[PDB]
Each structure stands twice: as structure tokens, then as C-alpha cells.
Write an enzyme that holds these catalytic residues in place. Structure first.
Site, PDB file in Angstrom:
ATOM      1  N   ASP A  69      21.286  36.266   5.695  1.00  0.00           N
ATOM      2  CA  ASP A  69      20.706  34.921   5.696  1.00  0.00           C
ATOM      3  C   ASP A  69      21.226  34.171   4.449  1.00  0.00           C
ATOM      4  OD1 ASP A  69      18.942  32.709   6.180  1.00  0.00           O
ATOM      5  OD2 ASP A  69      17.562  34.181   7.161  1.00  0.00           O
TER       6      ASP A  69
ATOM      7  N   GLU B 141      18.519  20.059  12.990  1.00  0.00           N
ATOM      8  CA  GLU B 141      17.078  20.051  12.616  1.00  0.00           C
ATOM      9  C   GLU B 141      16.607  18.694  12.051  1.00  0.00           C
ATOM     10  OE1 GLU B 141      14.922  23.526  11.116  1.00  0.00           O
ATOM     11  OE2 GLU B 141      15.181  22.540   9.187  1.00  0.00           O
TER      12      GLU B 141
ATOM     13  N   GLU C 106      20.048  21.849  15.945  1.00  0.00           N
ATOM     14  CA  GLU C 106      19.375  20.847  16.797  1.00  0.00           C
ATOM     15  C   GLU C 106      20.028  19.434  16.809  1.00  0.00           C
ATOM     16  OE1 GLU C 106      17.691  22.940  14.765  1.00  0.00           O
ATOM     17  OE2 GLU C 106      17.339  24.377  16.411  1.00  0.00           O
TER      18      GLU C 106
ATOM     19  N   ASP D  44      11.691  30.139  15.122  1.00  0.00           N
ATOM     20  CA  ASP D  44      10.813  30.581  14.055  1.00  0.00           C
ATOM     21  C   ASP D  44       9.393  30.823  14.564  1.00  0.00           C
ATOM     22  OD1 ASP D  44      13.099  30.477  12.454  1.00  0.00           O
ATOM     23  OD2 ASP D  44      12.562  28.590  11.465  1.00  0.00           O
TER      24      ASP D  44
ATOM     25  N   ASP E  28      22.588  28.421  12.235  1.00  0.00           N
ATOM     26  CA  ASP E  28      21.196  28.004  12.283  1.00  0.00           C
ATOM     27  C   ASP E  28      21.084  26.480  12.120  1.00  0.00           C
ATOM     28  OD1 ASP E  28      18.460  28.355  12.375  1.00  0.00           O
ATOM     29  OD2 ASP E  28      18.164  29.142  10.301  1.00  0.00           O
TER      30      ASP E  28
ATOM     31  N   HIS F 153      13.640  40.438  13.076  1.00  0.00           N
ATOM     32  CA  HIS F 153      13.950  39.436  12.029  1.00  0.00           C
ATOM     33  C   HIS F 153      12.676  38.697  11.602  1.00  0.00           C
ATOM     34  CE1 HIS F 153      16.254  36.347   9.896  1.00  0.00           C
ATOM     35  NE2 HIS F 153      15.733  35.416  10.668  1.00  0.00           N
TER      36      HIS F 153
ATOM     37  N   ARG G 207      20.853  28.446  17.632  1.00  0.00           N
ATOM     38  CA  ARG G 207      19.465  28.071  17.979  1.00  0.00           C
ATOM     39  C   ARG G 207      19.357  26.924  18.997  1.00  0.00           C
ATOM     40  NH1 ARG G 207      15.338  26.973  12.931  1.00  0.00           N
ATOM     41  NH2 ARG G 207      15.957  24.768  13.273  1.00  0.00           N
TER      42      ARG G 207
HETATM   43  C1  LIG Z   1      16.752  29.187  10.561  1.00  0.00           C
HETATM   44  C2  LIG Z   1      16.046  29.197   9.220  1.00  0.00           C
HETATM   45  N1  LIG Z   1      14.692  28.585   9.427  1.00  0.00           N
HETATM   46  C3  LIG Z   1      15.916  30.586   8.560  1.00  0.00           C
HETATM   47  C4  LIG Z   1      16.567  30.613   7.184  1.00  0.00           C
HETATM   48  O1  LIG Z   1      17.996  30.529   7.277  1.00  0.00           O
HETATM   49  C5  LIG Z   1      16.409  31.734   9.474  1.00  0.00           C
HETATM   50  O2  LIG Z   1      16.015  32.968   8.873  1.00  0.00           O
HETATM   51  C6  LIG Z   1      15.798  31.574  10.840  1.00  0.00           C
HETATM   52  O3  LIG Z   1      16.019  32.725  11.698  1.00  0.00           O
HETATM   53  C7  LIG Z   1      16.434  30.372  11.507  1.00  0.00           C
HETATM   54  O4  LIG Z   1      15.679  29.911  12.627  1.00  0.00           O
END
Ligand SMILES: *[C@@H]1[C@@H](N)[C@H](CO)[C@@H](O)[C@H](O)[C@H]1O
Length: 779
Positions: free
Chosen positions: A261, A379, A377, A442, A374, A502, A425
Site C-alpha cells: 500500500d 474519488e 472513480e 472499503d 486505487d 486486506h 476499484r
Molecule cells: C484505497 C485506499 N482507501 C486505501 C489506501 O491506499 C487502500 O488500502 C484501499 O484498499 C483502497 O480502497
């Protein structure tokens, strides 16, 4: 008021002029049609179509009041006055426009009783009729048992009338599935392409085959994608990452891949995103790290994101390169994310693609085996952000899709002999053709979060995404491990597409960091996952061939019973296993709505027969309820620590016999686990098994096809275990050679054929070489 004025045929497409403008109809296959309104205007291209330019030959017929435009199975019936198009498969009405095309608006009738799946990730009930929701990919941090809007929406539905409708539009929009008006399906967008695609089929499997034919088939992932992942948010250092790989070895859990990560590029969550390079204070020797892991058969996967912060080392360079989206003034657009102030890499531009792709190439040269994208979207995506092909609101729901395409093309260019691993994602219809492996974001560390995962997975599986999965054990918040929930989630994990526990690192996500009881429960199950690789990899193969999802809904079992569509609690893992995850604490028994037929307890071998009524099974902490369909061939290999060591020199196959299944088939797909061209070039070994079960005989015909591959075993030592075997078989012929069936001491002699009377199992042990083999059991 809209009415027909005239039409023309042009390069196999029908171009209709109404009083409002042009409509272009093109068959993309015999079962799929693209309908483009405002066809005269310039607009964004198709994202959903794998071959957006194709137009197969159709037939056109005209009457006083109608045109008919017809491929093999699908027909469009165009009423002239008032103008309205409706779609028929045979002479069955699938879908009819109401006022059709109206700032972008499509309105269709829904039929009485019609059930509508779709919309991608929502937690609303499997049938989304009665719901309205946005088409705008967006985070839903900490979700549990409800969501109208999350990471990966799809502008598509699947109906109980066995069509799929795609709104081939990338913009901020909405779907109203008979909510506002009980008999109206409305699709809306602020901007973007004014087109829809209708795909028909004669069964749910065929509909899915036809859909993936025109939207894209997922290339077979590397076999290692089906293994055990070590992941958390996040390993803080190389030493910690190395200690985790080590913990898998010392705790005897299988491990294929470790996932890093955002700490790989900076020590804080804020302020470093965009560095896209190693934090050397905490990862001092990352090439040695990745090489050391590769020696142990362990791959390294890194996280990346769309955003480059102004505080990051690559800001100045990204600006210089014109890699970032711009404002209307032409400056790089910067905006306040959680991580700090930053921009977004414009994957829709030549400059952004070349810049980002160069970074992936470099890191992949260093040893990175796969990629995690990651926040796609995206986001945060302010409205005035300008991309090369349109504004944020116009391109929003395709950003992730294009990001996958860029990275897929990049990885194919760099390593043409390897299969890319791309986990993201957010995407669009068709993103599976770029290898996208999605996960459900998440999710909260709650039973509700677990209880929603089957619904989410089935919804995404049905519309193209076979490798949809969840953060096993849950991701978000929590203060201390909910041990029972965690165990149930990792049990379910074995029977869903990607085995990736995870979570936020204040509670351990990896099974190797759990207490003795948890490990004693999970270790044999994670090994089971590896022992079952021939079953899972064969379903993967079928997903690449036909779009058939790995997880299948209960409703596939009886297409004339539309009430089964509501079920989100039991599903098929491949053809043969009906799985019912336990999704609340303390559950002592379950009622399983098994289709009528004969079924076996996977764990206990108990035989159940049913004419329709559900089966009640007791629960235990060590397993979740799994039934095997009579006639199943369940193939296993010995457990390995890593798929790099995978061999099928030794095969063990369990056949579930019952006289109610007089013909059964199974298959095992084997290739080198890595060649992206193995299917196309027939560089595989396809094992087939056929059982014929009559009153006095049970006959197995075994065979192999394909051209094989380097390292393929010529002869496999095979143990065939026949469950529920008659106690009246006296002899076995193997290719005409008669062998006596021993009736004692089967576990305690090197018996070639032995019947275990206490277990009702008949074990055959033989050599399966390249020529066909027939095994005949006779009373
Ligand atoms: C995206 C982020 N919110 C997190 C930090 O990089 C990841 O651990 C998570 O799996 C992702 O959704």
C-alpha cells in the site's frame, strides 16, 4: 412529437431520419444492436464496445407503419408514427421504447412482472426494480448493509426477459428503474454519448456469452492471481514486508503475492502521493527485496493512484510534461484531496498516458509483477477539471476504464509473454477486456459488510466481472478483531474469486497473524484453495471462453422460476458447488434452497435428495455449508506453497455418483499458468472425463486434447474416488484388462481398485497418459 421521415442503408448500418435528427443502428453481432441517437453530431465514442466499428450484415424489411432491422436472433421493430423502437428475440418482445430519446434522456417501458438486475455495485436487493440511483462512481467508505451509490457502478441492466441493456455513456447520470413511474425505465446523463446497446440470449449463460462477445472477454489472468495474497493498509517498511513473507513460511500458509500500500512511496498517508518511487528511508533495497521474494515464488504488487500532489517529487515534472488535467484557463488543475492539494493524471491524453506509462515501465523493470490502481472513480473529480476529450462530468465513469486500458497496453508491450495483473476499484462496461480485477472497496469490519458481498459479486459477475471480490475479513475501522466474523469471511473467501485478506493495519488482515484457533481453522482451508486450483482455473478458462462467471447466482438453476432472482445468500462456485456463507454470529443451522436433485455435504459426504424443499444443515465454526451436485467431478492436486511450484503429476478426482445422473461430464484445463496466448495457440492440455451410469454399470471415458505445453506431464498418477459407489460392483476393466475390486483394507494397501464399505467409496488408482482411457465397473 417524433416521427419517421426517411431511411438509408450504409455499410450494413441503418440510418433513420426523424423530424428531430438521425439515428444509426448497427448490429455488433447477431444478438446485439447499437442504437446511436444524434448520429449526425460529434460526440464521445463508445467505451462499452470491444469492436466499436463493426456492423455485421442484417436484413431490412419495410411496411406502411414499420421498419424491421434484423440480425440472426435479435430484431429491432421501428414504429414510424409516433416514432418508437422495440426489440424482439424470435417474436418475443424484449424491450420497447416509451418516448425513447428526449439533457440526455432515454425512456423505455417495463413489462408487468419483469425483474431487473443491474447498476453494478449497489446494496439494494438483487432485483433493482423500484429503485432510482446515480450513475456516478463514488466512494462509500465503511459501507455495510445498504448503498445506492459506490465505487463501481455500471450503466447496464439484466432483465428476467433475458436481455442486457447498456447505456453507453460515460457521464454523470442516473438510472430510474420503475421508481418514479412504475412502468418506466429511465436512463439520464448530463452530457456524453447518446447511445444504448441491447443484447439478447436464449439463456442466462448465452446472454452472458453474447454480452462479453461484444463488450470484451477477460483474458485469462496469471494462475498466481488465484493464490494467497498477503495484504494490509499498509506494510510500513521493507523489514516489515520481509517479515510478513517470512511469517507465511514459518506458519505454513500458502503465499503467492504480497501487496504494498501507499507507504512504499512515503511515511505518511498525506503529502507523498505522486512520488511513484520508493521511500528509501523505509524501503532501502527494494530490488533485492523483490528478487528475494521471487526466489521464494512470491510476487510483489504495488499501489498507484490517479493523483499527483503539489508536495510530491513529481509535481514539477508532471506539469512540465503536460501530464495533468487542466482548468479552462489551461493551467494544471489542483484541488484539495484528503492527502493534500493535487492534480489528476490525464489518462485520456497522449501526454498523460506516455508520462504515466513510462513510470509503470520503469518500476516493472525493477521487479514489480502486478499493479493495484486505487481511487479511480476518480474519488475526487471537480466539475471544471478538463481532460483531453471532455470535462470531468462527461468522462467520469470511464476514467478507471481508460486507466486500465493504458496500463494493460503498457504491460503487454513490456512483457508480451506474461499476463497482466491489474486490480482496480472503478471501471466501465467492458473493462474486463483490459484484465480489470475489481474489489468491493472499503467495506466495514461488520457482519453487514460480509452479508452484502454475495449480492455485490453476483451483480458485477453477471455484467462482465468474473474476478470481483472483497477485502477478506473487512477493511474499515473496528477497534479489535471480531474473530468469528473474520473466520467466516476468510472461509467464504475460499469460494470467491480472489483470495485477498486486506484491512487497515490497526487490526491484522493476514491469516498468519491470528490466534492458534483461527489458524488451525483457516490453514487447511487456504491449502484447500490451492488443492482446488484445477477446479478454479478451469472455471477461469470458461470465463475467458464464454464470460461465464466463476460465481453464479442460484437463479441459473431454474430459468423459469423468476422468484429465485431475489436470492443473495446461496450461490454456485463453478458448476458443482452450492455455497451458503454464514453471515451472522452464532448461527446454529441453515436452510439451503438446493435445486431439486441429489446433493452431497462437501465436508461430510452425507447424501441428500430433494424434490424442491430446502435442506437444513447444522453449522460449525470450522466450515461453511457447501453442497456438491451429484455428477460432479472435483479435481485436486497436492497443496503447494506457491503456484510457481504448481504440478499436476499427481491428480486426485472425486466423482459424486448417483443413478439420477446417468451422464456426467467434467473437464480440467491445464496450461503453463502464464502464457497470454495459450488458448489462442492451443498450447494447453484439456482433460475430459465422462461418466455413464446405468443400472448395472458405471463407465468413465477419459481423454486429452490440445497441443500441450512445455513441462506438461505425459503421464499423470490419478486417484479416482467414487462417492456413493454401489456395493455391488464386482469387477473393473481398464481398457479391456479386468482388475479385481478389493473389498477391504483400501486405506492400508497399494490397491488399484478398492471399495470402502464403511464410507461407500470406491477408489481407482491408475496412470492417465496421452491416449484415451476407459474404466468400466460392472455388477
Ligand atoms: C484505497 C485506499 N482507501 C486505501 C489506501 O491506499 C487502500 O488500502 C484501499 O484498499 C483502497 O480502497
Amino acid at each position: 412529437a417524433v416521427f419517421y421521415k426517411e431511411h438509408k442503408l450504409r455499410n450494413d448500418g441503418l440510418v433513420i431520419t426523424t423530424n428531430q435528427g438521425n439515428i444509426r443502428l448497427q448490429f455488433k453481432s447477431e444478438a446485439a444492436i447499437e442504437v446511436l441517437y444524434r448520429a449526425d453530431s460529434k460526440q464521445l465514442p463508445s467505451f462499452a464496445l470491444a469492436q466499436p466499428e463493426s456492423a455485421i450484415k442484417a436484413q431490412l424489411t419495410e411496411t406502411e407503419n414499420h421498419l424491421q432491422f434484423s440480425g440472426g436472433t435479435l430484431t429491432a421493430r421501428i414504429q414510424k408514427r409516433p416514432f418508437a423502437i422495440s426489440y424482439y428475440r424470435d417474436s418475443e418482445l424484449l424491450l420497447a421504447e416509451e418516448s425513447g430519446f428526449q439533457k440526455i434522456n432515454f425512456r423505455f417501458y417495463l413489462s408487468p412482472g419483469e425483474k431487473i438486475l443491474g447498476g453494478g455495485q449497489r446494496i439494494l436487493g438483487m432485483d433493482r426494480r423500484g429503485q432510482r440511483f446515480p450513475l456516478y462512481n463514488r466512494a462509500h467508505y465503511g459501507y455495510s448493509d445498504h448503498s445506492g451509490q459506490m465505487y463501481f457502478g455500471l450503466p447496464a441492466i439484466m432483465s428476467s426477459k433475458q436481455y442486457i441493456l447498456v447505456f453507453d455513456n460515460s457521464a454523470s447520470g442516473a438510472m430510474d428503474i420503475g421508481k418514479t413511474e412504475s412502468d418506466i425505465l429511465q436512463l439520464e446523463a448530463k452530457s456524453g454519448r447518446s447511445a444504448y446497446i441491447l443484447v439478447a440470449g436464449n439463456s442466462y449463460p448465452s446472454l452472458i456469452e453474447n454480452f462479453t462477445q461484444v463488450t470484451g472477454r477477460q483474458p485469462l489472468p496469471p494462475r498466481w492471481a488465484l493464490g494467497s495474497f498477503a495484504s494490509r493498509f499498509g506494510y510500513r517498511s521493507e523489514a516489515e514486508t520481509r517479515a510478513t513473507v517470512q511469517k507465511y513460511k514459518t506458519e505454513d500458509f500458502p503465499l503467492d503475492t504480497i501487496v504494498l500500500d501507499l507507504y512504499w512511496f512515503g511515511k505518511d498517508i498525506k503529502g507523498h502521493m505522486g512520488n511513484l518511487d520508493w521511500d528509501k528511508e523505509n524501503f532501502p533495497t527494494p530490488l533485492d527485496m523483490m528478487a528475494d521474494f521471487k526466489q521464494q515464488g512470491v510476487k510483489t504488487v504495488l499501489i498507484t493512484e490517479p493523483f499527483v500532489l503539489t508536495s510530491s517529487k513529481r509535481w514539477d515534472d508532471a506539469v512540465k510534461a503536460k501530464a495533468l488535467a487542466k482548468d479552462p484557463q489551461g493551467q494544471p488543475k489542483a484541488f484539495e484531496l484528503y492527502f493534500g492539494n493535487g492534480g489528476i493524471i490525464d489518462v485520456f491524453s497522449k501526454e498523460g498516458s506516455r508520462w504515466f506509462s513510462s513510470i509503470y515501465k520503469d518500476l516493472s523493470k525493477q521487479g514489480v509483477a502486478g499493479w493495484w490502481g486505487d481511487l479511480g472513480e476518480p474519488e475526487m473529480h471537480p466539475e471544471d477539471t478538463q481532460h483531453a476529450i471532455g470535462d470531468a462530468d462527461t468522462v467520469h465513469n470511464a476514467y478507471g476504464h481508460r486507466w486500465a486500458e493504458m496500463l494493460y497496453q503498457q504491460q503487454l508491450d513490456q512483457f508480451p509473454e506474461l499476463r497482466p495483473f491489474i486490480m482496480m476499484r472503478a471501471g466501465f462496461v467492458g473493462s474486463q477486456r483490459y484484465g480489470m480485477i475489481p474489489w468491493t472497496g472499503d467495506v466495514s469490519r461488520t457482519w453487514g459488510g460480509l452479508a452484502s458481498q454475495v449480492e455485490l459479486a453476483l451483480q458485477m459477475s453477471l455484467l462482465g466481472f468474473g474476478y470481483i471480490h472483497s477485502d477478506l475479513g473487512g477493511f474499515a475501522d473496528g477497534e479489535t478483531l471480531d474473530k468469528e466474523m473474520y473466520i467466516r469471511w476468510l472461509q467464504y473467501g475460499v469460494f470467491q474469486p480472489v483470495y485477498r485478506p486486506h484491512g487497515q493495519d490497526h487490526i491484522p488482515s493476514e491469516p498468519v497473524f491470528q490466534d492458534e484457533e483461527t489458524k488451525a481453522i483457516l490453514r487447511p482451508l487456504v491449502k484447500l484453495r490451492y488443492r482446488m486450483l484445477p477446479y478454479i482455473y478451469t472455471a477461469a478458462y470458461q470465463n475467458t471462453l464464454t464470460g461465464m462467471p466463476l460465481m453464479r447466482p442460484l437463479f441459473f438453476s431454474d430459468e423459469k422460476n423468476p422468484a429465485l432472482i431475489d436470492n443473495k445468500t446461496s450461490y454456485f462456485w463453478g458448476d458443482s458447488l452450492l455455497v451458503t456463507p454464514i453471515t451472522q454470529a452464532g448461527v446454529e443451522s441453515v436452510s439451503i434452497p438446493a435445486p431439486k436433485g441429489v446433493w452431497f455435504d462437501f465436508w461430510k459426504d452425507t447424501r441428500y435428495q430433494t424434490d424442491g424443499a430446502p435442506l437444513t444443515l447444522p453449522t460449525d465454526l470450522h466450515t461453511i455449508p457447501v453442497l456438491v451436485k451429484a455428477g460432479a467431478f472435483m479435481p485436486y492436486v497436492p497443496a503447494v506453497s506457491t503456484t510457481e511450484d504448481y504440478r499436476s503429476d499427481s491428480l486426485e478426482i472425486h466423482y459424486y455418483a448417483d443413478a439420477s445422473v446417468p451422464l456426467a461430464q467434467g473437464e480440467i484445463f491445464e496450461d503453463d499458468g502464464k502464457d497470454p496466448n495459450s488458448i489462442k495457440r492451443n498450447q494447453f492440455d484439456l482433460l475430459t472425463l465422462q461418466a455413464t451410469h446405468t443400472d448395472n454399470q458405471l463407465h468413465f471415458q477419459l481423454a486429452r486434447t490440445g497441443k500441450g505445453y512445455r513441462g506438461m506431464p505425459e503421464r499423470r498418477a490419478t486417484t479416482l474416488v467414487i462417492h456413493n459407489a454401489s456395493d455391488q460392483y464386482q469387477h473393473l476393466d481398464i481398457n479391456g484388462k479386468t482388475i479385481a475390486i478389493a473389498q477391504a483394507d483400501c486405506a492400508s494397501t497399494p490397491a488399484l481398485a478398492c471399495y470402502d464399505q464403511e464410507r461407500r467409496q470406491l477408489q481407482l488408482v491408475f496412470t492417465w497418459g496421452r491416449e484415451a482411457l476407459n474404466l468400466r465397473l460392472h455388477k
